[model samples]
Target: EWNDMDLRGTYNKHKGVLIPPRRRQLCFSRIVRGPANLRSLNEFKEEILKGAQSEGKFLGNYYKEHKDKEKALEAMKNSFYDYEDIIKGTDMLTNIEFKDIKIKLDRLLEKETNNTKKAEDWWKTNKKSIWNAMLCGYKKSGNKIIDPSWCTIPTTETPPQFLRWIKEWGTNVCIQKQEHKEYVKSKCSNVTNLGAQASESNNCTSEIKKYQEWSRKRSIRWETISKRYKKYKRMDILKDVKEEDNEKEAFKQIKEQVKIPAELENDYICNKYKNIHDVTDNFVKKSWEISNGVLIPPRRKNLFLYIDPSKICEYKKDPKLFKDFIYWSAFTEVERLKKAYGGARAKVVHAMKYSFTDIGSIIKGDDMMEKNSSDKIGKILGDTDGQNEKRKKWWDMNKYHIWESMLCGYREAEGDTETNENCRFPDIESVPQFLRWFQEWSENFCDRRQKLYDKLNSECISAECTNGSVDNSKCTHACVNYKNYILTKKTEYEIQTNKYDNEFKNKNSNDKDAPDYLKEKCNDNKCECLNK
Candidate 1:
């Protein structure tokens, strides 16, 4: 028989892989120790495999049927407690020992609870006493435990006394400090006040000295002015007297000088009279007749003098000057004609006719020919006397005839054979050119117009085509109609095609007898048939 200790140790040894050796040997020994007819070891082995402790009971029939002997042993170790009740019945000592161990544990727990309560009461009763002793010991040792030198005994004095002691000590120590601070403050105040007073005194002294200096200088200046005024007054008086004396001296000198020159003056005047007589004789000899006539208020010679020699001289005697004057006059005339004619009329004619010759002829009297001419020209043309004048004016004014000549040459080179057709007017051949330009312009204009029309249509459609209002004619360019066509087509096609595809997919997916060819062909490809 296996001891309980051996059984437990053996069970622990094979805890994860095999059954306990004690249990196995017990089962084998049971068969050997029993009657021969009871069962052989082989029969016991078979019984054990079939028992509730076998792997078949927990792992199901599959593992039990296919598992090898070693794997079965491992399975049995894993499921050791599968037949725990039956195994317990095989171990009477283990059952009794386990019960006794439970009893002993209960007894120990009861004793520990009794002792814990007793210790708690004991500790509570002694706590105050222990605290008192510890306090007493601390006091006896000057309240020091870890360090004695720095420790002191706590006295039973009042809190106010302790606070006062600390405050008195701090105040006593700070007395010198306060006295020093006061001394510093006093010195600083004295220095600052002295500095302020000195500064004020210095400023006053400076101002007073400056004022005194100014007064002294002012007095000196006044004295100097007074002396100068006196000196100037005396000098002025002396100067006036000297001037008066000098004037008298000058008058006396003038009288003397005049007295000496009077006789000479008379003789010279007589000579001058004789000279005038001789000059008058010469004048009478030179222009005696004219002089006598001009004495009758001297007919004022025409002083409206034409000083320009060219104007005064007859042009017949100066042909070169006359030619220069004529050329300048013609240039001025031409400028005047340009100022009169080259205005709105010229611009309009150029724009409309593009021909200066045509405009010029229309303006001149050339276009005034009579419809039926019996060779009896009009009065204007019959006046041959003024014909040269008219031709001259025309020649002077026709500076732009060069442009007209160039235009005519261009027309001739362009093969414009029509004799009577105006160059400015559009004929059949030019219609195509005009149309070509017009077509390009018109296409661009129309494209922009269409874009504007479409935009207006969208704006108007949004306002008018609300709430199922199917009418699209209110659109400017059929925008609403086009939008509705797109939306309706998209929705209708999507729904119809989706339904067809779903049905085809369902049929293809579920129909077992559907041929592979038909099934493959019946896929989503059927949706494309809607378009056809």
Candidate 2:
């Protein structure tokens, strides 16, 4: 070990302590290029259709598996090409054939145009026989009954009765059908007319101009009395009576009395006054101001009185009271006027009369007190000359300390000294320098005493011998030293007590076995011999 050792030997000794990690090279392969090609529309369409069909089939199968028969059928039908149309057309084919037959029958009826004349000729031949049977009430014997079948003469040689029945039925049906067709035609015509009117209106930019010109030339009155009518209605003028009757009578009277000159019946000025009256009345009510006048309440100094003498009369039992109210009201008015005009000029005038030095002194005194005292933090800083001057200056500088002053005043009054005073003045000297050293000394003394008290309070006697305590009252020893030993050599009461505690611990440690009384006094976790 004493010999000069090789440095390589030391390095070798620690070589095994380090571990090495293996490294490998990463390899990247080149990407192979492929030809660019666009798919034809037909090819793309085929692919989309195939996918759609597959999805449709899957949905159809799922519906069927769920035993939703109707849904499954609907899904299957949707999956096919117009499958519902095939079923619907098949069902309606019979109705189509019947309709075609009806069409042929109608054509035949149209061809027999001379059937009315044939019926007239047949009626003449049967007249005598029909009269004799009618006279006997159809009771005469051997009277060949005029055939009921001859009522309609057929153009195709069918039996008269059968033809008559078919003809009568068909005629009634055709009339009904014609009526329906006419109704539909009328509706279509109305729609077409409406559409034409709409189209014309869309293209007619000069219609309004034409209307205005015609109205001007014809002297058509544009004024309306509807607003007056509405006002009257709201007033319940026609509440119990009939409104329609009243309105009608009013309009008639208006028309009668307000006859416009035939030459200028529609003149713009002819009814302008009427329109103005109507509009004004429409928005008017029983005027509160006019009906009741203003209500002036009793004025007190502390309470705000917002009464206008011009609008209201002052009413009070005592004349002086009323006078007082008026005086204050006038004073308030003057104050407002002053404020409105109280800019630099007014300020300068005010400054000429007020001593700014006095203001500054008062403000400084208040600020000093507020900064020192904790309880007055949020108290309102009165608008005394001092505060007002300070405030005015602050406002002129665009700096506001209203909130800070209020908070300081409140905190001082509320006794939150620690928080209020701490934040108000950062330094002890900031609070008049005369009291600075005194406060510092008090704070330091409290801190030192608190520490000493805590340390002494935490000390305990040895538990080993005396079992645990050996009667701390009997031991003339103190737990901690409170005297300032560095400053004064004479043992203070607290220092003497600390010396007593150390001596007690030493004596207790010296005794190996505790006395009988001490052993008897011993309790849980407090035997002097075992505890040590």
Candidate 3:
């Protein structure tokens, strides 16, 4: 079984190639393991530089040819390695540990080091030799060589132009931070010295500054750099103040332009009739009524009280005159009553008014007086029927104060009336509950109104007054004003939208000169910010 397969291959004479073994014999040998020869630190350093140089040549030359720093940097990080990819770890000293000579790298791809305190010093000492040997940092055309001293090694750790920019950026950031800190500290000191009342006039700048400082500290402590710290904290307060000032000024201008007269405001249909009135006040006057089989005329008022038959001489002097006087008086009383209460609830309300009157003194042939006796007066006054129920229900559903707030000029009828439109009242069972609902509804309504105000403020500047006319034909004062506000704001948003769109295009056109960080930050929100 052991010798079943040939251990060695047979030679083929015709093919002129050796046939190797399909299987191998089991054999063991004593293996000697020993430490590889290690180079001196200087020699190994040179080897590391040589490997870096080779990688740099490939990247730098390509960048020089293509004039692309981004691609060169990307190539360095994407493919460059110390062990197998490009640079060789085997080239290092065999006895060298990571501490002695290490590549300390970070996720930023901006900061990296050789992990030697003396490495940077050593580079400075042999700056010329190292710079020349790397063959990195050429002109854009690749036809000319820049000064070795000016050239940076094309690597992720030492990106082109990074050193030059780092100095400028570091100084600018420090100066900006210090100036802001001093300004805030000064404001905070002022607020403290001036006392709490002064802070109100100052718009609580000192308190806000402290809050932001506290926020920044919390952000750092919580390790949430992406939150308020990155966006809000980075934004300068001075810029915010200036922007808000501009906003206020713009709003003030809109307010001035849309200066509606107090009369007009008061006259707005919605504002009118907000107060609760007696339900009978809205009643339609009933002109005539039928009693028994006779179609009777409207009942006259003061017929019995003002006319006296006891003055017989005055009546007997002229029978026609006395009859005329009684009829005229009756006519005057009926007209007065008709004018006082519309026909719809005239009977009920008039009976309610004179329920305590003597029944014998009641005007003759008056249908309302005839129908309403002492017994029926209670029901008529109390309105304990379905009509009052309907009225109260309708009042609850439509005529509540909240509806009155913004619903003028909308067709409104009595609660029991057949027609109504565009009304909302709290669907509440209790006074306090209804009030609560009204409060919330009012708050939300005001919020929406304020939003409209802001929108109009933002857009009305560039708009022509389209609906500003107040002929009071179809639109109410409030309606016309609101229509104008809405239309102008809509137009304004479109104008601003296009403006921002163009601005975005211009910005994108200029973005060729922008830094990588700026390019990276360009996102959906950035465009939205421009729109804002």
Candidate 4:
């Protein structure tokens, strides 16, 4: 309907929506494009009407003649305007006028007076005819639309396909689920700042200025040296120049020491740590003696777990001076001096004492641990805990060795390879980045070990490896060692899992038993007891 009459709307190009001054520009514009902007319930309409040409007839006069908020509200709800262009203003979601319009819409759209549903709920429930309620942010009152404030959820509704996918699959709910939840929380957090608040938080100058002079004096020199070894170097070099040989008449006492055996080639331990270890009766001196009011190396696990062996790589970043940065985090983190552990590991590590504690003995494999996590997480993998509070105080940890056992698991829709994609990286300004990397490392680390375990026993995969034998020659006590090792782990896991079943029954709960996966599962070829 190309009505030259509807000039008091958004597109009144004659530039006369305003009250014209002496010979003001007027009556030369257009109006009533197919769509309209309806972001905020009240002011969006006000802005739309103010944009209309007033000379031919004031837009208010044009619409005031019929003056029904319902007719205008329904107009835009059924169309689409560039949401990115839907500027903010008084009528935006959080503003007052929109609040008034929301009241009217409560009836027109049949919404609850006490509605608590999120935009996602409104997305599915308030789905109306045709497309987006054609809306945009232009205004003729010189007070054009502005972008809305943080977390401007639509208080009203939209028609089908009108950015319905944004609710269904946009970045907040899609690309990064974890970040999305935080954004949502932030929006609601202060009803404010969902900013990474990027620019300010990412500055290095600010990051470095947090520590005191004494500490700065100590760290001054090491910063340069630390960056040196952050990346690994290959020490490949030539040794053709000089060489020494045992004397022709070497002492008789050294004969046995020089007698190396051919079978030593298979020695795994010596080969792996050949650069460091010496085979002797002595073991690591795990004692805590303070030479200078500080235990040189912590011999206590009071507030921490055994330093993960993989953590050796973390120190490679400049262990000499970087230790302070890694440990104290002089800047970046809000909580300074936290465990700042590294490697692709989950934060689930330390706080989680027993890998299999029967703390929350609700169900098994999939019992909806926490509604927020299970039903809601509406965020990443989304999942929860009770009795777990006691577990946290215990200072439990999933020591480094078996950390990757969870790799057999996956994220997003599970069971697919590489779907976890393991998105992570390293940056000094990023404590969160480091933490996420550690989690990725946890699964990756364990997967590496599990893979190695399978490879080591590759020769034994034959039936002979088991009791049922053909040649039976390859079947040595070592084969039984492999099986016992798995079952030993299997049983250890069984004890942990069975504890849950026991706890569930102790609770006097219903359901015949716990989750099926709650029952420990194992395979002769692999080591983990409870498969994910």
Query: Against the true structure, whose TM-score is highest?
Result: 4
- Which pairs of residues collide in candidate 1? none
Query: What digit string (tens of lDDT, one per residue) describes model 3 on residues 1-532?
Result: 2221231123222211111121132222322322357645576566556645454455444454435455344334332422222122213332344423344321122244533454455444543455465354544533332456453444324333223323332433334344444554454343324453542434444445454564453334323322322444343666635431122233223222112210131244443333222112323355333345332322223233443436656654667875555435433433343345443443433242232122211311122444444234343244432335553443343323323432332233334453333233323223332233222222223334556566554443544445666334322333465765465456545654554464486444442332443334334443222212
Task: Give the alpha carbon lDDT tens digit for every residue of 209-316 in model 2.
Answer: 343353342232212222332344344455667551112233223222112211131233323223323101211123223123222211111123334435333342
Q: Which of 2 and 3 is ahead in TM-score?
A: 3
Which lDDT value does model 2 have at 216? Answer: 48
Best by lDDT: 3
Compared with the true structure, what per-residue lDDT tens digits does model 4 show for residues 9-86? 644433222211111333455554434653555553444433322221433334443245543332222212223122
Number of clashing pairs, model 4? Answer: 34
Better of 1 and 2 by TM-score: 2
What TM-score do all the candidates reach, one by one?
0.11, 0.12, 0.18, 0.20
User: Judged by lDDT against the true structure, how good is candidate 3?
Assistant: 0.37
What would you estimate as the lDDT of candidate 1? 0.36
Model 2 segments more than 4 A misplaced: 1-431, 462-532
Please list the C-alpha lDDT of all candidates, in the order they appear: 0.36, 0.33, 0.37, 0.32
Q: Which candidate do you rate higher for lDDT, 1 or 3?
A: 3
Q: How close is candidate 4 to the true structure, as a TM-score?
A: 0.20
RMSD of 4: 29.5
lDDT, model 2, position 269: 31
